[PDB]
């Protein structure tokens, strides 16, 4: 079995290997990359996402989210307070202000220490989940607005034609902005490209050990667990690496820098934080190997998780027994 310790793997495809996205994903899995839950892909040196980022400041963040924490430094939840709209230029200036800017630090490890020590005492503002793309239309390789759609993959594998669309989302981050522990909707893959700015640190639990994380989370967040049998779908809980180590949960960590792709694999729980002002683009995708994960994915039916239009069909076709209860949650 390849990669039996579930280490995060890093790949350096040549320009030739970068042509066929599906083929490269299947290659990475042949080497065991999925066992980690997360992989890094460094694009060939000849590739570029677009020519420059000099003209992005007029993009609108219609609903910036202030991420307010509650709990203790290593075990906390966050709620998202909606703020007034602002442009990317306005947000960048805010991220760079004294109140929100990255502190002086020695290296990524010192910054990681400071994040876990001090995150809860601040409420950074995240421009998340903004439909759109920063890939040039002429970029033909690994262009996250030109991937094959998940609806087309389900149709190719299973023969059933379904409604829905699959588009990318932009993320504008600042120091301490945080992504809570989660897997993707319907335990899909995700791909994330860091277009510009400061790094993003990731934590990940191997898919084969995801239930260990869930059992810890039920212990650490006991009221939330009673409220919903899939409350990590709410995407609000954080647990530090120190706490994960104390409780014997297998995980790995890696820092993504500008110009790099990360892939998350089906049922790979992940969480992380931004080092400073940055912009990422991400989208969900599927392969044949996902189908079985989609059929088994947990679901939130309490009403909190509220998701896209396109998840309806996935539930309806892959999880018909759960469909009625899940749909009630959506309405
Ligand atoms: O970058 C972020 O804030 C969150 N991204 C992801 O969870 C992802 O790409 O799957
Ligand atoms: Mg602009
Ligand atoms: Ni994710
Ligand atoms: Zn729920």
Overview of the structural elements:
The PDB classes it as oxidoreductase. The entry lists the keywords PanDDA, SGC - Diamond I04-1 fragment screening, Jmj domain, epigenetics, oxidoreductase. The chain has one domain: Sandwich (Jelly Rolls), CATH 2.60.120. A 10-stranded mixed β-sheet has the order 1-2-14-10-16-8-7-4-5-12. It has a 4-stranded antiparallel β-sheet with strand order 9-15-11-13, covered by helices on one side. The radius of gyration is 19 Å and the shape is globular. The chain has 10 helices and 16 strands. With 331 residues, it is of the alpha+beta class. 26% of the residues lie in helices and 26% in strands. Bound molecules: N-oxalylglycine, magnesium ion, nickel (II) ion and zinc ion. N-oxalylglycine (OGA) binds next to strand 10 and strand 16.
Sum this structure up briefly.
Keywords: ADP-ribosylation, Chromatin regulator, Dioxygenase, Iron, Metal-binding, Nucleus, Oxidoreductase, Transcription, Transcription regulation, Ubl conjugation, Zinc. The chain has helices spanning 21-30, 88-95, 108-118, 150-158, 210-220, 222-227, 241-246, 290-296, 311-318, 320-330, and strands at 9-11, 38-41, 60-61, 65-72, 75-82, 86-87, 125-131, 169-173, 178-182, 189-197, 200-205, 237-239, 252-256, 261-264, 269-274, 278-285.
């Amino acid at each position: 079995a390849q990669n039996p310790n579930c280490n995060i793997m890093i790949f350096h495809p040549t320009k030739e290997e970068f042509n066929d996205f599906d083929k490269y994903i299947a290659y990475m899995e042949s080497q065991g990359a999925h066992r980690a839950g997360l992989a890094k892909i460094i694009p060939p040196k000849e590739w570029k996402a677009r020519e420059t980022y000099d003209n992005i400041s007029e993009i609108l963040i219609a609903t910036p989210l202030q991420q307010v924490a509650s709990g203790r430094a290593g075990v906390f939840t966050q709620y998202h307070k909606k703020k007034k709209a602002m442009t990317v230029g306005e947000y960048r200036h805010l991220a760079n202000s004294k109140k929100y800017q990255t502190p002086p630090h020695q290296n990524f490890e010192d910054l990681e220490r400071k994040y876990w020590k001090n995150r809860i005492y601040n409420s950074p503002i995240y421009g998340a989940d903004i439909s759109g793309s920063l890939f040039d239309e002429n970029t033909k390789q690994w262009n996250l607005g030109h991937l094959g759609t998940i609806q087309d993959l389900l149709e190719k594998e299973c023969g059933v034609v379904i409604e829905g669309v699959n588009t990318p989302y932009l993320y504008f981050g600042m120091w301490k902005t945080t992504f809570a522990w989660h897997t993707e909707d319907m335990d899909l893959y995700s791909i994330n490209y860091l277009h510009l700015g400061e790094p993003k640190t990731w934590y990940v639990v191997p898919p084969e050990h995801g239930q260990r994380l869930e059992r810890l989370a039920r212990e650490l967040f006991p009221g939330s667990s009673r409220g919903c049998g899939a409350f990590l779908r709410h995407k609000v809980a954080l647990i530090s690496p120190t706490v994960l180590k104390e409780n014997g949960i297998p995980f790995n960590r890696i820092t993504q820098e500008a110009g790099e792709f990360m892939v998350t694999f089906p049922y790979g729980y992940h969480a992380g934080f931004n080092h400073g002002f940055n912009c990422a683009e991400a989208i969900n995708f599927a392969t044949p190997r996902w189908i079985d994960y989609g059929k088994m994915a947990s679901q939130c039916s309490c009403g909190e998780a509220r998701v896209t239009f396109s998840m309806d069909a996935f539930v309806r076709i892959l999880q018909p027994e759960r469909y009625d209860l899940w749909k009630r949650g959506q309405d």
